[PDB]
């Protein structure tokens, strides 16, 4: 029907997400953030499930929950390999981020912090993940539509190209 999402696989991964994105968290709990990446790395459908789960948390109306979700999403990009990158590089996932920033969707009830972090991530990905064509398609369209006026500054280090 809905696959492993409805099964133990999904329930477990969402349980891990709750922990890593609990709005009660004093700050980012990396014990739970990284643990979520590990579960994804061992699960056959970890990436497919995870991105749908992350997309949902990111679209949360509660700020701290969405923000931590964006941090976990970042951790997964650096710890879950191409298999994870490949699922984020599909419109099936990207359209969910677009709803967060477009006023025609959730756009008006999402803090500016969330929307800018989302923009910064998408942009950061166009630089770091050139072989993920769909991500720039989604980014440039946000530009072509005035949602993103000028590319934002992003966290960078020597490992980034």
């Amino acid at each position: 029907a809905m696959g492993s999402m409805a099964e133990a696989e999904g329930e477990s991964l969402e349980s891990w997400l709750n922990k890593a994105t609990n709005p009660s968290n004093r700050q980012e709990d990396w014990e739970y953030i990284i643990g979520f990446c590990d579960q994804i790395n061992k699960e056959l459908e970890g990436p497919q499930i995870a991105v749908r789960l992350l997309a949902h948390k990111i679209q949360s109306p509660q700020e701290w929950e969405a923000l931590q979700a964006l941090t976990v999403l970042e951790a997964c990009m650096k710890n879950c390999g191409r298999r994870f990158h490949n699922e984020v590089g599909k419109f099936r996932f990207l359209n969910e981020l677009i709803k967060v920033v477009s006023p025609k969707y959730l756009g008006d009830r999402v803090s500016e912090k969330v929307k800018t972090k989302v923009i910064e991530l998408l942009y950061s990905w166009t630089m770091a993940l050139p072989e993920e064509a769909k991500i720039k398609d989604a980014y440039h369209m946000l530009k072509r539509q005035g949602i993103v006026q000028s590319d934002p500054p992003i966290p960078v280090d020597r490992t980034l190209i």
């Binding site: 599909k90 419109f91 099936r92 990207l94 359209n95 677009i98 709803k99 477009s102 025609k104 969707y105 769909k134 398609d137 989604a138 369209m141 539509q145 949602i147």
Partner: peptide, 8 residues
């Protein structure tokens, strides 16, 4: 297997 870009 993928949806079309969400044209806003």
């Amino acid at each position: 297997s993928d949806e079309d870009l969400l044209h806003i």
